[PDB]
Structure 1
Amino acid sequence: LSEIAKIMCDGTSLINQMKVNLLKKNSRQIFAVALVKHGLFSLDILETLFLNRAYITAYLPDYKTLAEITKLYKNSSDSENANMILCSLRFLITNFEKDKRHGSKYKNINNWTDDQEQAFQKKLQDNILGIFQVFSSDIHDVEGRTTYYEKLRVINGISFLIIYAPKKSIISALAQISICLQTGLGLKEVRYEAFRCWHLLVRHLNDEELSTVIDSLIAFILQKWSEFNGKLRNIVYSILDTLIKEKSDLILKLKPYTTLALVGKPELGILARDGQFARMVNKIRSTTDLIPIFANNLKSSNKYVINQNLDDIEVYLRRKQTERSDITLVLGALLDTSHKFRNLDKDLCEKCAKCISMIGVLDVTKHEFKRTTYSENEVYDLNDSVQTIKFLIWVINDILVPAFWQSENPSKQLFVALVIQESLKYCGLSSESWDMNHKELYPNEAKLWEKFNSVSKTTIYPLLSSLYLAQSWKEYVPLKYPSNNFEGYKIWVKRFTLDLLKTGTTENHPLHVFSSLIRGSLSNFLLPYISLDIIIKAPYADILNGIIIEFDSIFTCNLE
């Protein structure tokens, strides 16, 4: 026990203060978790450790957040002992139960508690949130402790989570952990067993899933083929085999594009391994105008997927034309590709231009599907409370969904969970949309919220922190002048904080404002929908607060 004393002293005169700080760290650090896995689960022994060199208050209080992942980060044939120890550590999360005989009883034999078979379900689905927060902090931050040792261990642990997780906590942040493992695999060294993990996912997930993550992998593999060794190719083959066998309708009917590309890449032996697979693939292909399919694939942004799209589109167009023979949308797709590229990666832009070379000006009479407008539609946020419901669902479905899905932003998903559940109190009982005759009939399923329907119907954890922003409200000169001076991003932030100023009704506006409260273009999109309340009112303080900027920016210091 004096080893910690020596370590702190090397850290001396205030070594007691050092011990206090280190104990504070160990409250949620891996100290409690690893002691639990090493010695036992007795909270009395935990107090004994709290008296090893002193520093016990946080024991009951700090029993949940970070020690959960700290324990999770060791999930790694004889270690079944460690597996049961860890699973028992998972059993014991409740600090009160730790104080109770449960404290020394949750490390019992295999036949552990059985009310835990649902209470423990609730427990794990709760701070799956926190442990994901931990791991994304371990991955997508700066991590001056780069140390992909952590990445490896976290991958091991999350794989064991696939080994043991209910559908609900799975989908709690399936897509998030997908992005985490995805950027892992993107990183060089991870792949060696990142693909192992991918296979572990493959062996048992779902049917509705196995879409929103698989194409990324497909693009990766059918793109980087050069730098794949023997055994990488071997595991790849196993993966192909699993793809063929355990979930065939997905590759054949629910995402056939991958099959198109891989077959058109003829150094793989798809027909050699399975000639029956080849038949079906080719049939469906020659059968349904692949142009809209490539259009949907170009709607996946990223980079690898876009490149695969471009190449395969070129090949298809070439062969079809050499023959003799909708057609339009690829052109505008490429337009956006280049437009985003217009500042990033000239090679991608040149690929878009090569596809446009194959196509070209063609005919203008041939109707161009360029749209007319978009949805800035309203739905009585004041009256017709049903239309207010429409208002909120419109807000969440329109753009909050992909942001809540495609964003690479750890903390923002916290607000996602919080305020989206706060919006989901309109469907708070899970069985409303889940097993019941209940007529929740939730709209805007979007196949993503539908993918999230159960995972958000009653997975609500409040997470409602926001404070101390009222007085400094940049409004009336503090806003018009700041925007006319510079900066503009913070100008938009301040303006949209007109809700923090004088809006935020607890009905809808409070949660709506606190939504982006984590805080970047979304500001402009959300901005149009504020001063209507006051201009209804017939208040004047916030009215001027807004109007000052909203009319001074008319010609605010041009020709700066």
Structure 2
Amino acid sequence: QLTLTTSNDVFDTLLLKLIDIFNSDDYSLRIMMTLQIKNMAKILKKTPYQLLSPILPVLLRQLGKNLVERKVGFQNLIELLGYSSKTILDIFQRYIIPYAIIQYKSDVLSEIAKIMCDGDTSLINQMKVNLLKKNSRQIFAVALVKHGLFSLDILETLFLNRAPTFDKGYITAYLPDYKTLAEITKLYKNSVTKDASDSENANMILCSLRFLITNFEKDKRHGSKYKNINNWTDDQEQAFQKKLQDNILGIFQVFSSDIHDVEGRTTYYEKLRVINGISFLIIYAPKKSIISALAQISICLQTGLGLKEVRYEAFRCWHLLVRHLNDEELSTVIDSLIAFILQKWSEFNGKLRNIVYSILDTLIKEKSDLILKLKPYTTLALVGKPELGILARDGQFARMVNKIRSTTDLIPIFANNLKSSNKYVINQNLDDIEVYLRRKQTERSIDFTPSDITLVLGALLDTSHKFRNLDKDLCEKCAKCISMIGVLDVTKHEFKRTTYSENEVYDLNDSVQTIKFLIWVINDILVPAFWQSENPSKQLFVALVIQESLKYCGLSSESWDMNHKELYPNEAKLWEKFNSVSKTTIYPLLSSLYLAQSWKEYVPLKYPSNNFKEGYKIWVKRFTLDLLKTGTTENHPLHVFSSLIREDDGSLSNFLLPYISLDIIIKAEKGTPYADILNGIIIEFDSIFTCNLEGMNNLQVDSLRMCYESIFRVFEYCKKWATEFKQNYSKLHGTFIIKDTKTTNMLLRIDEFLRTTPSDLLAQRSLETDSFERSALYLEQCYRQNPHDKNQNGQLLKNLQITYEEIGDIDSLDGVLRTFATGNLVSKIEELQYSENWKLAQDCFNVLGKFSDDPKTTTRMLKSMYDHQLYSQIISNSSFHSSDGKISLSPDVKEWYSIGLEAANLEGNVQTLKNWVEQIESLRNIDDREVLLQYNIAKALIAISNEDPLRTQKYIHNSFRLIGTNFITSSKETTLLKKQNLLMKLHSLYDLSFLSSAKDKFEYKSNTTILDYRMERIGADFVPNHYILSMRKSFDQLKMNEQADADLGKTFFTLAQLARNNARLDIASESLMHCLERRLPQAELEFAEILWKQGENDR
């Protein structure tokens, strides 16, 4: 229990101190140590193997010196670990064979062979020579550092007497291997105590690097002079610096292989000594080698920070990195750990907080160029956490803080930070946005320009749509930030809409546009994915693809960028189209040697075997992978991209799916199997569309929506590519658009590809997707191509009018309801509910809906009441009150209960709202996504009437969770006209939290003035204004303060004069009458305008 109080370094030292008194050969000490080690292992909820395995590379390493004498100590250690003597021996063969080989001649290798193969009737020689060939890299490593054997014949002879069956000296030319260089530099022990013994092995591994790389074929044999350090002349230092950086990205590839250990091959001792190797290469290497592979060690140190026991060494390795490197080439990596500092600060002990203080004071004194003006988010984020305490440490840094906040517009650097990948920076951006907007509300000058706030709103919508099935919490706080933004005016605020643009059209046949496609796909999505990768294997695969794309573009194998060539204008003007934030990261790996084919375990599956029963991201990755490896054949430049989609999140697969499918289209006259796999994906699209879609809950249908969208994308890309191909084919190649009857045979296959799985079924599977404009497009296509003289216009139109009545457009809905659809009179009644005589249609629906023959003619009445704000008339309906209560579990009554809860919220009455949730909570398993939102808002209001602030905050946070995971969708695709129905609910969820968060009237009045400020960004449309004022109304009459009642009269007066300016004085009168029990001195004037708009002038 002295060890239980310690942490990562001292803990591992004290465990070795536990074991070297475990083997003290005193019997009492041995049994007491077995007992305490086992109880310590169980009270840490571990086994003794996974307690002592982080020091088993150290403990039994010196037992390679004494494995013949201390057989009983090794036997005690293997009975403590609970494994066999072989099982810990083939997994820790990496650590003791580099010492058991190189020692004195009477080897312990015979016993390690006697255990590593059972019985001498199994032959020890071949197993001995293949274990000696198994870890020969570490043997070379220890031979070069721990003894200084810089003579190759010494290595050869000291092998061949330990194994005479060893192949032709050593396994030849494997000394300048990347793995041997990595295992050399992993043995750089480093501490704050720079000792002479710590400089000795530092110089030894530096001189072994000098032996291995700069002159190997010159100096295979004569290497005894390299053991000296200072005989290294300046004739050979720059040749060493040249040969080091053709030989540094692969040793970081080996480092990336053995940090992110995928099969559980090793513990974190490997990770500690990889971080030691990174630290050695940060100190002892030229600067151009470290500017080069910075994005290797970034996501090596990220995995070091992520794992718990290797955090301190990785912070110290960053501290080494942050000062051996300049200001501007540090911007690429500073966000990912300033986020880790600010988001994982709480569990840091004293030592980790001291080393992070030593990060930050170094970063703010000597490298304030990065922190202040190169990216000012990294200082405002550190100021934004008061638990850290930046400003008291310097004091003069506060002089820079209190002017760097003002002069830097902060919105677009929240915008391009929310498109990141790792969860730490997009929790810090959310925690900074919810404090930024909270400051800007009280500051009353958040910008709404007719630096746009709609940029960060679109970023937040895309962030919440990205994480709909992963980490509900950041979608919660993301939707809370969207609510803090509020409803934008839909007129003067719009998203980016990069649709009429360069528009992703690239011919994959000509060279001049294929190179433009590759430079575009490198610039916009491969360069960001190169930095923001999670595991380093994905970053290596992105590096491979982004290298081979440069190799196809004629930039890699020859080198020209040093400007000493200059006879390459065709390559320089090509290179200039890269931007600098991609240029700096694409420059090193022109000459790199990434090669990760890894083939012949592929098994191409035939197509209609569907992948739907696993997920969407399973399906699109497997389908894209089944396509592009069966239709490219290693010369077309989309072949390398297959290395990305065994670790994709589904985004890059969905990106490349139209391009690879369109390149499979142009393979003609079936002939080859390239059109045989086309017939596979036609029936795979048939498997997508003609599916069941019932019998499954609300997540397999969500995956089916995504499977719809991913292959609507390929249809519009085939159509777009074919039309631009016709356009530029008739533009440049002649003018008369017909030629040669063979590119016409290309253009016919898209035409049967856009007429297969045909319409009446694109529209059927797209209107349920909620892309209502796309469904309207396919419905009009299957109006024109369908012979519309015939009578298919009955089943065509019962959903065609649905595709207009929530698209926003009325003037075609009113035009289709009165043209070729005039059979039934009820259809003529449904024209009235959009044309100013809506109440003439309401009371017709009230008696059509009181026939009790259909379930849907009731919900037509309820939706028509809700669309015309008749909330009090919804909650008084007899469709719910049979006598007092409602019916059981809900086939279609969920569509009724949603409207009922929402109207019960919008009229604030605790009795009609408090017994509605008595009926909701009598149900068993509420599946409906839409009921539970208004339920949670209802119980927020019921708790807010019980003067209970934390409970109503709890239920409003439930509402934000449900909106951020379920209701919310993708930005940059939809309008703002369809997001607005959700933004009004979010804007009404924020003001309930903002009016509940008050203790007395002094801040309650200030909250109401801030909400009146929030009623100025709202626009002037009637529906969101009436919704938000109805929710402040429902707050102010469930909390029976007298100041809330004085607020309530103001809300009713604003509802009244809102509704009489919007030609809806039906409710302006019955809202102004609430201002007469209070007897305001102003309602005598307001009733005059209500009388005026009604039509009576003289009164």
TM over 0.5, shorter chain: yes
* Bigger radius of gyration: 2
- Contact conserved, 2:418 with 2:426, CA < 8 A, in 1? yes
Q: In 2, distance between residues paired with 1:440 and 1:404?
A: 29
Instruction: Give the alignment of 1:48-59 within 5 angstroms.
Output: 48-54=157-163
**Partner Cα separation in structure 1 for residue 482 and residue 624 of structure 2:** 44
Distance 1:30 1:101 in 2: 18
In the TM superposition, residue 187 of structure 1 has moved relative to its aligned partner by 2.4
Q: Provide Cα deviations, 1:434-467, integer angstroms capped at 9, x if missing partner.
A: 8755798999999999999999999999999999
With over 3 angstroms needed to count, the CA separation of the structure-2 counterparts of 1:355 and 1:252, relative to structure 1, is same
Deviation at 1:305, TM superposition (A): 1.9
The alpha-carbon distance between structure 1 residues 93 and 544, as it changes in their structure 2 partners (threshold 3 A), is same
Moved more, 493-502 or 361-370: 493-502
Alpha-carbon separation, structure 1, partners of 2:611 and 2:198: 67
Could you report, residue by residue, the CA deviation over 1:122-168 in whole angstroms, capped at 9, with x for unpaired residues? 44323423322322232222463552222222112211110022344
Using the TM superposition, name which of 36-45 and 219-228 deviates more: 219-228
Deviating more after overlay: 399-408 vs 70-79: 70-79
TM-score (norm 2): 0.43
C-alpha distance in 1, partners of 2:577/2:111? Answer: 50
Deviations 1:183-232 (A, max 9, x none): 21232232333222221112121232221222222222233443344444
- What's the CA shift for 1:276? 3.4
Q: Is 1:27 equivalent to 2:136 in the alignment?
A: yes
2-structure distance, mates of 1:193, 1:305: 22
The answer to whether the Cα contact below 8 Å between 2:256 and 2:536 also exists between their aligned partners in 1 is yes
1:535–1:170 Cα change, 3 Å: same
Between 444-453 and 271-280, the greater mean CA deviation after superposition = 444-453
Larger deviation, residues 146-155 vs 369-378: 369-378
* Corresponding residue of 1:525: 655
Once the two structures are superposed, the pairs formed by residues 345-364 of structure 1 within 5 Å of their partners are 345-364=471-490
CA contact (8 A) 1:531 1:546 kept: no
Write the deviation string for residues 462-511 of structure 1: whole angstroms up to 9, x where unpaired: 99999999999999998664345758989978997899889877996156
Cα distance in 2, alignment partners of residues 205 and 444 from structure 1: 33
1:490 aligns to what?
A: 617
Give a deviation string over 1:34-73, Cα, whole Å, max 9, x none.
4554241111111012213227557679686676567666
Pick closer, same or farther for the CA change 1:373–1:23 going to 2, 3 Å: same
State the shift of 1:246 in Å. 1.6
CA 1:102–1:524: 2 relative to 1, 3 Å? farther
**Per the alignment, do residues 335 and 401 of structure 1 end up closer, same or farther by CA in structure 2, a change over 3 Å counting?**
same
Secondary structure class of the residue paired with 2:593: coil
- Cα offsets for 1:360-405 (capped at 9, x unmatched): 2243334122525387845664676333321221232232222333
Contact (CA 8 Å) 1:259, 1:281: kept in 2 or not? yes
Aligned partners of 1:466 and 1:154: how far apart in 2? 21
Deviation at 1:24, TM superposition (A): 1.6
Quote the Cα distance in structure 2 between the aligned partners of 1:338 and 1:535: 35
Secondary structure of the residue that 2:666 maps to in structure 1? helix
Q: Does the CA contact (< 8 Å) of 1:401 and 1:449 recur in 2?
A: no
Asked if structure 2 preserves the Cα contact closer than 8 Å seen for 1:9 and 1:15, the reply is: yes
1:307-322 → structure 2 map (5 Å cutoff): 307-322=427-442
1:536 aligns with 2:666: yes
For the 8 Å contact 2:301–2:314, the answer to whether it is kept is yes
- Cα distance in 2 for partners of 1:493, 1:7 equals 48
Give the superposition deviation at 1:322.
Answer: 1.8
Residues 103, 197 of structure 1: alpha-carbon distance in 2 compared, 3 angstrom cutoff = same
Contact 1:136 1:180 in 2 (8 A): yes
Q: Give the whole-Å Cα distance in 1 for the aligned partners of 2:598 and 2:364.
A: 60
Q: CA 1:448–1:281 in 2, change beyond 3 Å: closer, same or farther? A: farther
Q: Is the 8 A contact 1:30 1:70 kept in 2?
A: no
Structure 2: distance between partners of 1:450 and 1:30: 47
Which residue does the alignment assign to 1:164? 284
1:558 aligned partner: 692
For residues 532 and 25 of structure 1, do their structure 2 counterparts lie closer, same or farther at Cα, with a shift above 3 Å needed? same
- Are the structure 2 counterparts of residues 514 and 186 from structure 1 closer, same or farther at C-alpha, using a change threshold of 3 Å? closer
Comparing 216-225 with 91-100, which one deviates more in the overlay?
A: 91-100
Deviation string, structure 1 residues 267-305 (Cα, Å, up to 9, x no partner): 555443434322232223123332223223323342222
**Per the alignment, do residues 132 and 275 of structure 1 end up closer, same or farther by CA in structure 2, a change over 3 Å counting?**
same
SS at structure 2 position matched to 1:497: helix
- Whether the aligned pair in 2 keeps the contact of 1:219 and 1:305 (CA below 8 Å) is yes
Worse-superposed segment, 427-436 or 528-537: 427-436
> Residue in 1 aligned with 2:503?
377
> 2:562 & 2:596 partners in 1: Cα distance?
44
Change (3 A) 1:269 1:114: same
Does 2:188 match 1:73? yes
**8 Å contact 1:243–1:251 — kept in the other structure?**
yes
Please give the secondary structure, in 2, of the residue aligned with 1:494. Answer: helix
In the alignment, is the contact (CA less than 8 A) between 1:151 and 1:184 conserved in 2? yes
Give distance in 2, aligned partners of 1:446 and 1:303: 38
Write out per-residue CA displacement over residues 85-134 of structure 1, whole angstroms, 9 at most, x where no aligned residue: 44324531489538733444443432236554344334432342332232
In 1, Cα distance between equivalents of 2:343 and 2:627: 48
- Seen in structure 2, the aligned counterparts of structure 1 residues 472 and 283 have a Cα distance that, compared at 3 Å, is closer
The worse-fitting range, judged by mean Cα deviation, of 457-466 and 533-542 is 457-466
CA distance in 1, matches of 2:153, 2:182: 17
Deviation of 1:256 (Å): 1.3
373-382 vs 265-274, which deviates more?
373-382
Whether the 8 Å CA contact 1:337–1:349 is kept in 2: the answer is yes
1:512 Cα offset (Å): 3.8
Other structure's SS at 1:467 match = coil
Q: Note if contact 2:275-2:301 (Cα within 8 Å) is conserved in structure 1.
A: yes
Inter-partner Cα distance in structure 1 for 2:153 and 2:580: 39
Greater mean deviation of Cα atoms: 292-301 or 109-118: 109-118
1:554 Cα shift? 7.4
Q: Which runs of 5+ in 2 are unaligned?
A: 1-108, 164-169, 192-196, 445-450, 695-1099
Whether contact under 8 Å (2:518, 2:549) holds in the other structure is yes
CA RMSD of the aligned region, Å?
5.5
8 Å contact kept, 1:477–1:549: no
Structure 2 CA distance for aligned equivalents of residues 479 and 174 of structure 1: 39
Q: In structure 2, the residue corresponding to 1:532 is in which secondary structure? A: helix
For residues 381 and 585 of structure 2, the distance between their equivalents in structure 1, rounded to whole angstroms, comes to 39
1:133 and 1:19 map into 2 onto residues whose CA distance is 29
Counterparts of 2:674 and 2:306 in 1: how far apart (Å)?
54
CA distance in 2, matches of 1:341, 1:484: 25
Contact persistence 1:295–1:330 (CA under 8 A): yes
Q: Verify the 8 A CA contact 1:84 1:110 in the aligned structure 2.
A: no
Q: Deviations over 1:532-553 (max 9, x none)?
A: 6676577875685667557755
Farther off after superposition, 441-450 or 425-434: 441-450
Classify 1:42/1:547 alpha carbon distance in 2 versus 1 (closer, same or farther; 3 Å): same
Distance 1:285 1:8, change over 3 A: same
Contact 1:263 1:278 in 2 (8 A): no
Deviates further, 42-51 or 465-474: 465-474
> Using the alignment, how far apart are the partners of 1:439 and 1:550 within structure 2?
52
SS at match of 1:228: coil
Residues 458, 45 of structure 1: alpha-carbon distance in 2 compared, 3 angstrom cutoff: farther
Change (3 A) 1:409 1:234: closer
SS in structure 1 opposite 2:411? helix
Q: Which moved more, 1:207-216 or 1:338-347?
A: 338-347
1-structure distance, mates of 2:465, 2:440:
27
Comparing 426-435 and 277-286, the one that deviates more: 426-435
Seen in structure 2, the aligned counterparts of structure 1 residues 135 and 483 have a Cα distance that, compared at 3 Å, is same
What is the rounded CA distance, in whole Å, between the counterparts of 1:474 and 1:56 in structure 2? 26
TM-aligned CA deviation for residue 236 of structure 1: 3.2
| Cα distance change of structure 1 residues 527 and 429 upon mapping to structure 2, 3 Å threshold | closer
